[PDB]
Amino acid sequence: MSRDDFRVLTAVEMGMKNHEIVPGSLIASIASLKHGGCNKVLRELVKHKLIAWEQGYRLTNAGYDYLALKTLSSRQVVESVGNQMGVGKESDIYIVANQQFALKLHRLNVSWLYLSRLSAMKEFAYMKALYERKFPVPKPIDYNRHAVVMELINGYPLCQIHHVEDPASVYDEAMELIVKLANHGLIHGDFNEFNLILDESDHITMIDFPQMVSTSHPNAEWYFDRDVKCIKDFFMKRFSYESELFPTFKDI
Amino acid sequence: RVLTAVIVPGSLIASIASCNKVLRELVKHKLIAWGYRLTNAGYDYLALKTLSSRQVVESVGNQMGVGKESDIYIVANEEGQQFALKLHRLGWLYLSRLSAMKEFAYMKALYERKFPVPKPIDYNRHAVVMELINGYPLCQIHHVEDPASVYDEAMELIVKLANHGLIHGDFNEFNLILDESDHITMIDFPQMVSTSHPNAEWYFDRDVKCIKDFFMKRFSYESELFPTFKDI
Questions:
Q1: Is the peptide bond before B23 cis (omega within 30 degrees of 0)?
Q2: B191 vs A89: CB contact, 8 Å cut-off?
Q3: Residue A176's domain is classified under what CATH number?
């Protein structure tokens, strides 16, 4: 938590963009601690498992979470961290507060810490776009490194719901979402019971933002049919509901 | 250098590049557009020049196909050895550097563990250069000598990946290439799901059903034996 400890931790990350194993000598120069004590600071961090000595030092996964959280605390976004309230396709979902929000930490010669940095950016970019285009997605608050902070949704994934008031209403809302995305030139590619959250007012909200397929893509009709088939199957399997008029590529 | 220096004002470009009309020289060539920004065509040039500088890509190519979020071209080095160039197109630009690096990382790993994937040669920006496979995607194949051998090879691939702790997530007729000796080779790896994931059984079943469905619709082959998730 000390200002010196933070300078040294940021320097291990700084030198990591040119070195796999950052030498202690390189860390000293970036941290610029004035009256030294760099190697004493490096010893604390290793014991705290924020860095690992594998000759030099490398940043641990735990140390990367600390850097991202401190930066989001610095911006007045995350003040307290709650419990891990789930797992995404390649992420860890925690509950945060400044009210209450959702923190998504992305977990995947190139280093995977940097790849996670971009995976976060991609999610924030897709979320920022769709939200502005008035789509049922959680509001993106901010992002830093592998951390994405968004609106906390009071709901459970569709896959956990065994009894629903009206399945027809819920079905129509999922199919309208597939149409709305398609008319905006996008196909989800993973539109299913795990990526959709149903809230207290029984409204669908998409929470997974993978790599979305363009409608101009040669195999777009196949990906569109797969998403429509997924909803059709789940509703017929769980709530035993069937409909004759389902979206087709002709609707787009 | 001017292209590497490149909305960016002309005054800023001058300072990085270290004169004037050079500028409309590549605006006309559509390598940059209106301050001035880099075009998708200009980004391909930067990546190709760097791969030419490393003696990996010497000649141009005919776009032989399209990936889920990429453009597949044919390349050749000074020697004349033909390779496959994959330019990542996300539809930013710095994000296409992710999909490239991520693909190269997954390809490097899977190849080393002796998986049927094209050999990764090198990567830069949104460009990934790999081994050229003499084959067509399984979706273009309507007739095949033995459907049983091809089916077994696709199902063994699903098992082999699962026992390593990975689930493809998009294992289908577009991502698999069938060569002259009728051997399956994986050409896409966008988002692989871990077997330790809570919904891994659902993703594994989806891949297995997306081979059984295709092998019935085309070829009209069905086999009693097929992979189940409670095998690892």
A1: yes
A2: yes
A3: 1.10.510.10
Q: Which residues of B are annotated as a binding site for ATP?
A: 86
Dist. CA B71–CA B66, nearest whole Å: 5
Nearest chain A residue to B197 by CA distance is A89
C-alpha span between A183 and B172 (Å, rounded): 25
Q: Which of A110, A192, A210 sits opposite B191 (nearest CB)?
A: A210
Experimental method: X-ray
A115 & A189 share domain: no
Q: Which residue of A has its CA nearest to B88?
A: A211
Which tokens hold the place of A92? 């860890």
Domain range holding A242? Answer: 155-251
Residue A143 lies in a domain: yes
B104 and A CB contact within 8 Å? yes
Catalytic site residue A227?
no
Name the burial class of residue B230, with classes exposed (0-12), middle (13-18) and buried (19+) by CB atoms within 10 angstroms of its CB.
Answer: exposed
Q: Quote the longest CA-to-CA distance of chain B.
A: 71
Distance CA B182, CA A194 (A): 36
